[PDB]
């Protein structure tokens, strides 16, 4: 149920169909990008390049 | 330069199946998303689906998914258009197009010269 | 989705004056993180290919004459021609590429006024 560690390569914003966040029990407490290939990508939730991601999937969704 | 090469105009019948072609050059294929545009005669232009030619990760217009198919085949630099079985109404200028590299998403920034479609018995 | 919407549908310009062509859309295409809007400007001349003129609401492609700018923000944006040539007609479509579907307006026409 959490993030043993976060990705460190570029998040592909392309590929993204949406995110959540994880527990606050976990260590590496993650936002989690889901692909449209239905891969998960575990990120910082306070990275710069994270935070504009989320903004933008939430945009398409709200 | 950048170039796209589609194939030539086609005359066909209804029920009948169709592929046609769009080929890059000038340029890492893999490396752009191409476009596929439908204009009906007199009509605008309807963006109809792109392809991401590296792992061939296709998204359709619901207005077009399930309707047409989109490929590419990463070996020959080439992206496909294909219908199983043509209508008289899939008469139309079609286009492909290379997506732009910026985020999220981008403009066609080059566009292939357009296959004309003509269907009628 | 996001609509696309043209106004006016056709446009009669005297040789040498201002055109402005307008576009909206249904939602914001404004990215804000990346401050750019999605919005790109093509021509399409008759029995031609559409040619990309404008992106990023405001940055003309290479080689496109400087007559030729757009402007806008958020939903509500404008072509303007500042003085027509002749070569200048052609159908205009504005097209949002915030998200996919990245629609397109429903075009433009500009011909020459007499």
């Known amino acids: 149920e959490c993030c043993l560690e976060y990705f460190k390569g570029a998040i592909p914003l392309r590929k993204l169909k949406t995110w959540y966040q994880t527990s606050e029990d976990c260590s590496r407490d993650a936002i989690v990008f889901v692909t449209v290939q239905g891969r998960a990508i575990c990120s910082d939730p306070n990275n710069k390049r994270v935070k504009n991601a989320v903004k933008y999937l939430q945009s398409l969704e709200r | 330069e950048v170039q796209l090469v589609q194939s030539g105009a086609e005359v066909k019948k209804p029920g009948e199946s169709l592929k046609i072609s769009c080929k890059g050059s000038?340029?890492?294929?893999?490396?752009?998303?191409i476009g596929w545009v439908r204009q009906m005669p007199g009509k605008g232009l309807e963006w109809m689906g792109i392809?991401?030619?590296?792992?061939?990760?296709?998204r359709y217009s619901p207005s077009f998914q399930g309707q047409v198919t989109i490929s590419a085949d990463k070996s020959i630099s080439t992206a496909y258009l294909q219908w199983s079985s043509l209508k008289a109404s899939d008469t139309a200028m079609y286009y492909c197009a290379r997506v732009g590299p910026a985020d999220v998403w981008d403009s066609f920034d080059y566009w292939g010269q357009g296959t004309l479609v003509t269907v009628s018995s | 989705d996001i609509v696309m919407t043209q106004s006016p549908d056709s446009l009669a310009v005297s040789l040498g004056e201002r055109a402005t062509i307008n576009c909206k859309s249904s939602?914001?295409?404004?990215?804000?993180?990346?401050?750019?809007?999605?919005l790109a400007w093509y021509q399409q001349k008759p029995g031609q290919p559409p040619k990309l003129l404008i992106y990023?609401?405001?940055t003309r492609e290479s080689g496109v004459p400087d007559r030729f700018s757009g402007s806008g923000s958020g939903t509500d944006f404008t072509l303007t021609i500042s003085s027509l040539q002749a070569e200048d007609v052609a159908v205009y479509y504005c097209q949002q590429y915030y998200l996919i579907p990245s629609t397109f307006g429903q075009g433009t026409k500009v011909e020459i006024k007499r």
């Open positions: 939602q914001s295409v404004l990215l804000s993180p990346w401050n750019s809007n999605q």
């Open positions: 990023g609401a405001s």
């Open positions: 392809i991401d030619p590296s792992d061939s990760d296709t």
């Open positions: 000038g340029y890492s294929f893999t490396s752009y998303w």
